[PDB]
Structures are given as structure tokens and as C-alpha cells.
Design a protein around this ligand. Sequence first.
Ligand SMILES: [Cl-]
Ligand SMILES: [Cl-]
Length: 129
Amino acid sequence: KVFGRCELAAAMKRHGLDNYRGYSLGNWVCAAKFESNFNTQATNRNTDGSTDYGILQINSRWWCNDGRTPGSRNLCNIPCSALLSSDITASVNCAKKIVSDGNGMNAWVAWRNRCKGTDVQAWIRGCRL
Ligand SMILES: [Cl-]
Ligand SMILES: [Cl-]
């Protein structure tokens, strides 16, 4: 599923991400925009053999199990496939664990390079929330 902008904002707001660990909703929509272009089915292979999955591109090296990342962990205790669902609950719950691990949203390289320090509020402007 390819979300619309206001549509994803609303769903992320249904699931508790607005101001989670201090990050307003615009930060999370901005991050999804550049990680996946709002597509829950996005996947991308990393040079080390790990893979990023879903609308927030969560990595198999640490957070989910795909059966093909030697030496990895599965700290969210989920198969990576569950991160591709049109329902975003699994991605949201694992994101909450990631952003609380010490480095905040700097865990998402694309947030650091494309959202951090910008007018992220523009990503929710106009939306009925
Ligand atoms: Cl915002
Ligand atoms: Cl980047």
C-alpha cells in the first residue's frame, strides 16, 4: 500500500507516534517520505547483506528476522515480512523501540540528512488530524 501524506499522518497519529520521545508528527512523515515514498512494500538491500523493510525501512541486522542476515539480532521479535503489511502497527511498534535506544531518530540516516533541521511541520500542513 502507498499511503497519501495526510492519510499516513493520521494513521501514525492513531498509533501514538505524535511526540513519541519528543519527535513531532512531521518528523515521522518526513522520514517515511524519504525512506519509502510512503510505500509499505518498500525493500532495499544493504552492502553488508542486511535488508531494510517497510515504510520506515527497518533493518534486519538488528530489529527483525528474515532468515538471511548472519550474526544478526531480532530485537523487535518479528519476521521482517510483517513490516510490509498495509497495517502499519508492526512498523510503528518497532520504530518506538528503535528511537528509544539512545540516538533518537538519528538511527534513520535519511532523517538526519533530509528532515533534521528543516520545517518538518510542512509535512502535516493542511491535514485534518
Ligand atoms: Cl510537526
Ligand atoms: Cl540520506
